[PDB]
Design a protein around this nucleic acid. Sequence first.
DNA 1: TGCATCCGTGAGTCGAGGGTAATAACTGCTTTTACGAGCTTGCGAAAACTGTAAACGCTTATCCACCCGTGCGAT
Length: 50
Amino acid sequence: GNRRIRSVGEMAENQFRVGLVRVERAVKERLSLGDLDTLMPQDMINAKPI
DNA sequence: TGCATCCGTGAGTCGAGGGTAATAACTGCTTTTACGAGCTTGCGAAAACTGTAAACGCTTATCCACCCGTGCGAT
């Protein structure tokens, strides 16, 4: 009752939040630096770290 | 004199299957290094040709002694 089972769909979800933190670095470092009246969301979002 | 932080230990053969990925600038300007191009020597081959002591087969000049050109003889 003190030990718990963590299967594939949970361990793949913990590893998807780790990749999404790398979005929270590069987005907050783009909304202050980058242009405003031109920037689409496809431009700022990377695909490699996630 | 404990008390608290710290350094250093932890069996052996095999085995299977393999190697990663986040993100980073543009410009003009000047010096160095490579790549292909075109010669210059030179070096190993091909194809001819002028010096010597044997160089493949083959004639003679000799000498001489087996044999016998013949004759005549042996019982």
